[PDB]
Amino acid sequence: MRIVVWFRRDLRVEDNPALAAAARAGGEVVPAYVWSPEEEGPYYPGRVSRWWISQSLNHLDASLRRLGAGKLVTRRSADAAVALLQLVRDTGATHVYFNHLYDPISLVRDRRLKEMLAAEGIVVQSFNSDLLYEPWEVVDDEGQPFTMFDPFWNRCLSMPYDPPAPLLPPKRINSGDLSMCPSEDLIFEDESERGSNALLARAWTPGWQNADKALTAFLNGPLADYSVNRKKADSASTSLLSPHLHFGELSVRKVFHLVRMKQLVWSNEGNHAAEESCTLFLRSIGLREYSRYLSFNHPSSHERPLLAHLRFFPWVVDESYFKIWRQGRTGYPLVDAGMRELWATGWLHDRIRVVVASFFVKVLQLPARWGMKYFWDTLLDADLESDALGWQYITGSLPDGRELDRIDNPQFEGYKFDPHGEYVRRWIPELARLPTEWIHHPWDAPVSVLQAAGIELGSNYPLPIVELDAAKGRLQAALSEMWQLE
Amino acid sequence: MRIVVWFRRDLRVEDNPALAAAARAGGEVVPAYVWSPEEEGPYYPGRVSRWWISQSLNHLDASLRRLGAGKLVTRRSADAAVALLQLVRDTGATHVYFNHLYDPISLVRDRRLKEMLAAEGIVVQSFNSDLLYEPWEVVDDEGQPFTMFDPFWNRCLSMPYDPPAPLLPPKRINSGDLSMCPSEDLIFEDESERGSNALLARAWTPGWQNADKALTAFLNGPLADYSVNRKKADSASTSLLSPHLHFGELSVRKVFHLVRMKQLVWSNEGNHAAEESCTLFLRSIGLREYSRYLSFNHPSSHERPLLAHLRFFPWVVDESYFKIWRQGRTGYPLVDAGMRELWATGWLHDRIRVVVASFFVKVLQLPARWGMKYFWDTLLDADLESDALGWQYITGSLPDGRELDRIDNPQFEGYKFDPHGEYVRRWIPELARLPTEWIHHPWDAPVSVLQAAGIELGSNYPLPIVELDAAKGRLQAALSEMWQLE
Amino acid sequence: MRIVVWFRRDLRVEDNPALAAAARAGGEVVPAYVWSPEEEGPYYPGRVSRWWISQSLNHLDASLRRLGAGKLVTRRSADAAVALLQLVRDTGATHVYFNHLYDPISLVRDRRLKEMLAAEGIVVQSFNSDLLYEPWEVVDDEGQPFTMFDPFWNRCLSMPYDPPAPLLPPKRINSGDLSMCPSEDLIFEDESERGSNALLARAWTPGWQNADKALTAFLNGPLADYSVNRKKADSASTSLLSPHLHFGELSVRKVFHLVRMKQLVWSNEGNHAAEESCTLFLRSIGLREYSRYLSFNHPSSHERPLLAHLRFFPWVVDESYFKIWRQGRTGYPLVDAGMRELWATGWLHDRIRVVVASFFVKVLQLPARWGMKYFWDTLLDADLESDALGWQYITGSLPDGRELDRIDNPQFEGYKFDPHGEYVRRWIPELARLPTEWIHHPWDAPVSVLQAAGIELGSNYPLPIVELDAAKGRLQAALSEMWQLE
Amino acid sequence: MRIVVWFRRDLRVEDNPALAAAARAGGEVVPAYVWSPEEEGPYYPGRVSRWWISQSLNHLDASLRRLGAGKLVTRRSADAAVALLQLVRDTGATHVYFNHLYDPISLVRDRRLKEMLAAEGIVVQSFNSDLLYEPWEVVDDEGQPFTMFDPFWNRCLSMPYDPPAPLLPPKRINSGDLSMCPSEDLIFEDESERGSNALLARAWTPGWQNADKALTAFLNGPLADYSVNRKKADSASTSLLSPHLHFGELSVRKVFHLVRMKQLVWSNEGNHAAEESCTLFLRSIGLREYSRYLSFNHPSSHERPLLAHLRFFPWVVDESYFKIWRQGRTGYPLVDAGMRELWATGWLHDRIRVVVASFFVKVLQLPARWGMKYFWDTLLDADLESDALGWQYITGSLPDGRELDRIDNPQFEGYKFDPHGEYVRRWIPELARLPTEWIHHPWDAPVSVLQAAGIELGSNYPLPIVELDAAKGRLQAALSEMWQLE
Numbered sequence A, B, C, D: 001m002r003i004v005v006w007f008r009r010d011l012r013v014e015d016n017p018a019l020a021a022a023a024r025a026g027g028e029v030v031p032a033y034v035w036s037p038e039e040e041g042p043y044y045p046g047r048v049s050r051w052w053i054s055q056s057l058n059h060l061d062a063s064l065r066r067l068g069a070g071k072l073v074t075r076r077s078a079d080a081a082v083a084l085l086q087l088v089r090d091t092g093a094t095h096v097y098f099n100h101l102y103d104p105i106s107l108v109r110d111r112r113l114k115e116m117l118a119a120e121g122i123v124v125q126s127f128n129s130d131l132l133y134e135p136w137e138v139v140d141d142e143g144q145p146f147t148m149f150d151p152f153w154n155r156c157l158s159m160p161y162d163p164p165a166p167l168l169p170p171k172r173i174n175s176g177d178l179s180m181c182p183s184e185d186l187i188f189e190d191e192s193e194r195g196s197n198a199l200l201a202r203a204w205t206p207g208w209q210n211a212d213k214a215l216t217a218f219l220n221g222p223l224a225d226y227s228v229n230r231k232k233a234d235s236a237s238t239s240l241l242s243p244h245l246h247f248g249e250l251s252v253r254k255v256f257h258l259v260r261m262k263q264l265v266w267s268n269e270g271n272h273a274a275e276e277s278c279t280l281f282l283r284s285i286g287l288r289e290y291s292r293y294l295s296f297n298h299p300s301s302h303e304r305p306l307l308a309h310l311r312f313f314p315w316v317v318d319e320s321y322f323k324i325w326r327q328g329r330t331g332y333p334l335v336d337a338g339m340r341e342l343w344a345t346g347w348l349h350d351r352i353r354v355v356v357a358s359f360f361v362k363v364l365q366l367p368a369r370w371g372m373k374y375f376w377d378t379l380l381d382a383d384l385e386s387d388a389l390g391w392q393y394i395t396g397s398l399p400d401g402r403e404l405d406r407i408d409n410p411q412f413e414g415y416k417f418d419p420h421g422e423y424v425r426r427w428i429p430e431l432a433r434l435p436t437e438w439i440h441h442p443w444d445a446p447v448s449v450l451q452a453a454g455i456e457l458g459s460n461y462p463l464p465i466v467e468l469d470a471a472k473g474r475l476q477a478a479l480s481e482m483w484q485l486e
């Protein structure tokens, strides 16, 4: 009843530097979650990403009632600023203790939020939660922002001062009265998909308590061989904690500590593989930090994301091709098993997001905004930076890699990410007897080894809708339309 | 170089009562395997059942060379009797120590084999390996054979004398010379399927050494709850050792001992569930013993198997329906996941052989000899009795159960064998988001819960080729053709 | 109420070939245990060996009530023959189904028992339980008994016929009425040691159910390295099941089966160490079988045991020396830790029975009947053959080994049985800092390394009562009294 | 070659805030260990405490060479200040980066060290390593130090600001040249006890790498039931890490973090026992922090330790009584097993230091400086504060507990610390058969239960040198000499 913390994307109580700075403030703290998806514009957050919030908020209530604090109130309005001002009015609070995000749509909203509340009479203070450093204090030589990643992260490990350690969770807090503020339940998922969304719990359980159980099971397990099992998609040794790390159920400053703390343990035991796989796991953590630093600084993705160097190219406006690739009647088996895992789990491996999405533009030749709006709706780790950073990288625009005029060609795009075919036979079991040479290209197989395996192309497994040698040249008939104008 | 043992379907060295009776015979023993599939008539043994033999023979050689004995010679001819007489001629042997099988095609061959060898001058002696008792010494009240199972097996546990215990494996044997007999390698699998058959090793490894590893992993594991997990097909708690138990890699007299020996351990520990699941596991072992006793005695399946009370009914002669059911474009999802597991593993659960095969006759209305000849070609536990006993039982003819004029109706044929749908979503992952009420019948679902789950019937998942209410009456238009003639 | 089985030293229900031959006999069986220790003469069985029976009988009652059978009646009289005749009179039984033992005091009693019962009118039948073969059917070349062990056991593995396998335990039996026979409880242990005997349960739990738990924990565990950890006494890798194997709680025919059954498993896995340690474990089992065969056949230990080639030698008649060696104020540390383990556990390692008992005769020069009567009173595996076979062997009389005119000399009698000193420091912790060179001989140590370790000889740890160089010649002053008379 | 760190009692590299503040200082760092035990006066550190340093320094060299840094130089002189000034002269260093200890003998030495080096021209800076807070910033109400513990530690958990978290270990450091400074090996242990000290490695391995292996094995293990297994000495569930925590191989700020971090994990799982045993483990950690705060502040143990309210009382000057209690010929079995564990392991439980030391003064009536000088010589966790705080507490002088005019009386001083007698029978196995009522007092036993257990008092187990009812009044004849003078 003195200060408020309102969570936005930090759904945790361990080392949260707005709740722990509320416990030692002396007065009473009441928490909050204002839900306004109409403010976020075209980035109405997901459809299974909206499922994760409703099960993580209810996990946060029973984890924060045991520290005291009564409840976690949840209000709903069109914009945050009317609802948050009505919250300090209803409760009679003096401060607002939030922490700044780095979306280009919330950064304009946060200074607009700090402009409404401070002119009223209450005082606010922002903090730094889901980032190692802050993106304005990391600089290059003179004063500028970086424009690449490998010059950037070489400054990020060789800082003058180390990142601040995970500060202690609070001992106990107090709300005073749990009934002055009339909280209300609110819908997140639709009523037609009230039962079809509960089938994502076969692989994913949300909550902050399951975030550190998933972290510690990775440190003892697959971190010792992350340097070699990084690309292989058949085994689940790739630390499936990015939905925890996107919604702030796991702090980046704790994963940076515990990996570095046990890098020293393996460093003086002669394990040269397990110490190499710790500098390569923190590099991937730095890719998350670089995407937040990119949308805040100089490029900024100035008005909308999915933007670096295109949006003329003569795409086919065929909706039924978007009905085939979404369903998976595509014939190319590696982009077909990846398109079935995304629907069944709400999850893909990073190298399988490489081949599913690059097939969507370079072979199928569809507009890339149809690929984002489908990835945005059914995925769990669907943020505004990394979905914009990754689509930028795979379809080709950072001077980092994965250029155009280059189709996937799954003959050798599969022998690096899936050597034995344990990923194709897991997800399309109608292809489970092809002897691992034609499991990545059944249309290149002779008729004798196909009729022996029980696959008749056309009835059991569909033909490729677009041939590989066709779109190897049909792209260059369309990509030359860039190179006459730019 | 004195006596010969020739293995037929007892590919093991532990408690084999023809090899152990060859070690204590004093002289030298040479083993053999004569392969004549042209003698077996229409029962040319399998196509993946022929894969299991080629990998179990080579497992038997390296397991019997370490007892001595030099080699395991393998000859090939049209009939066994010319090849076996040429074997005692080439090696100068005096005895033949085999053990009698119980196929109606080998029982006529065995007395024909004993008729050729004894008239030459050499002496033979048969033994009893793959059976608990012998089928002529188990009798009913006066002198007759039984005609049912539950009167039969009540005599089989209440015998005057117990079955003979597993006699010790031999200490060491000797062949003398490993080069007098010019052995030859021989083909089992085709050259077109030399690589597609090696993909059954993802679930099955043959050999007698893996038979007791699979047995002991079941006694400590799923035997404690076999009485409740008997019908459920989603979990693999059903002791997958019938391909070991068909080819004689695991003796029935050892499984009867070790289950009964540890039934006593659980009997005086208060475990009333784990002692009930031992009388129900030996009952299923007795179903194997009853099928061998049935083809030898009174019914005998007199000239051919797949025979009890039919073969008029007006079947559709449509080959493309046999191309749909073999592939699995059938729409009924429970008989579709079962039709994909049979092709991927060469294995089905016993209650899934119930619903796949009864759909083949009572709904699709195809001739049952097309169902045997497909089951015979791709299955591992494809014998001559139990494939004939089971097709007789499920399609309805023993006074045991599973009568006609009764379709499967998977609305409640699935809630006993697959309660949560973990078996359908494992094998058809294009149906992985239906909320477990319409996972067994997608065509009975409303359009809203189907478009939310991403299934559009006709493109993603095919329609039912034959409706359920159609064949519920279209059978009775065809089954009345029995009841005017019989 | 038709036949009786009376247990003597076969306190088990698994593969007991008098109870299982009572179940299939048709009539009702009542079990019994007649306790007459006054018949056994000087071999009144033990004082902790009498503790093991009272806790194994009560374990047998609750293990045989669950098969039916009502009770296990226990009567007490001076001789067995009056009590057993009063038992068939009280119950009206027709047969007596026991199994013959091989003590020279029970073999004369058994034919005296068969002489009383058969002349009355009832019929008896003996069986073979606690032996592999029978000692009259194992012969040498012409017709004679053997006189050694290594010629004997070479016949015992190369028999014409294998030993009979473990026959199945009974399904269920029936006593009919549990109150016609007025059974009575009876004392085994004294009332002064009613509480001091319950402290042997810190290491030993009796019963037949714990016999196979102790057997299977050895087969998976220390049997793979029994060939190298056979002599080392510090680690408990030596299969502590001889108290189970003496009282018939574990059949010898089952241990011969399960070791031989899994010798084949390790034989075709390349484990040359684990297959050697199975031929050396069955050799030690054969030492138990040889001692039973020795007291029945030609030497017979004709009127009393502890007898092969002595009982003149001029022993000291000092009782206080027998008070020192029993207590352990002896100074020699290896025979002192062994004398403390025997009192604390009722158990010694076989190589520690070697050095404790040979020090008792060759150095202390006491009469050997004081050593048996002390070993008989406090030990668990105190039978009439192996206690007589072992004292015969270590003090020297079989042409097998461990001759006289040879003291122990623990300088190198310890570096084979206890290399690091983990056995001395476990049992005399007042010596726990001597640096493993003088842990086996503290009196041979300099004064500086003794005062640094905190041992002052005379107050903390006593001096040797008899010097080593004294009894190295004082024996030969007494052993020359043999060699003038024999 | 720019700054030096010299370790004193912080033998670790993880979160050491003088080495990590040396890595980010830019220049080159060389480490050091100056060994001057002649400066410490009567507190020449231990004889097995001197063994722990020689094996932890050599563990620190191979753990700090892999971070770079060349070596760890070790010089020896009479005082630290001549040797440390000769070290900055030999290497040409500019700074000295140490961290202040809290002994009253080093606190006078540290400001004397800062007085020599700063007047030369080099600059020093101290840090805070082995303490949670600093002892001058924890205050009571007005400005004073505390005089008790329970008022003190209630301020220590309710501080305004939390203790600083474990700061990251260094990435890599550099010495430049490893041969400019002529380092020398040095003796720690005597040559007479070069081999008797290596027998403490049966229970203790030193080093900082084994400190966190011992910590994490306690957090997963016995911390869940520390609240009930705190007093019981028979089981080793009491987190044996005080020799790691005394020599600075494990930071107190890390144990405070990891216990508090997983107190939250058990707090929201319903484990009310495992969350109570975390507030009671940090209390014991606070007892270490209170003893350091006590010798620095107001009482200070002004010129020497072992000092609070005595040193007149008429002690017996008998050296042979000090030869009995050191050896353990004392008859009282609970103080005898504790006196054998201290010699065998160099370790005692905290409640066994309670009864061994209080028997030394209140019953044996010896001067307490003979008890410290014996505890100082053979113990591992022999510091200057807690050895002074504990002797003060048990023999009675803090207003905390354990007053005088109160003997131990092991009849009920044993049924709280050793209920079954598993601690007495472990260490005096000559008493291993007493039936747990007279295992704590054999002289109070009747003769029948003693002769049955094999204990004859006087020869096997010695009599009590001082009777219990004697020193219950003979103390009060000597304690009245206090109460006439004070």
Ligand SMILES: Cc1cc2nc3c(=O)[nH]c(=O)nc-3n(C[C@H](O)[C@H](O)[C@H](O)COP(=O)(O)OP(=O)(O)OC[C@H]3O[C@@H](n4cnc5c(N)ncnc54)[C@H](O)[C@@H]3O)c2cc1C
Residues within 6 Å of the ligand: C238, C239, C240, C241, C242, C243, C245, C246, C284, C285, C287, C288, C291, C349, C350, C353, C354, C357, C379, C380, C381, C382, C383, C386, C387, C389, C390, C391, C393, C394
């Ligand atoms: C002086 C002396 C006295 C002995 N007194 C007894 C006694 O009272 N009771 C008794 O049962 N054994 C006795 N033995 C035999 C030997 O000590 C036992 O084998 C002992 O129990 C070893 O136990 P174990 O389980 O470690 O043997 P293991 O290594 O496990 O051997 C398994 C079995 O082998 C048998 N066995 C092995 N070695 C011998 C042997 N040398 N003689 C006889 N059997 C053997 C035992 O019955 C044992 O159950 C005595 C030996 C000596 C030298």
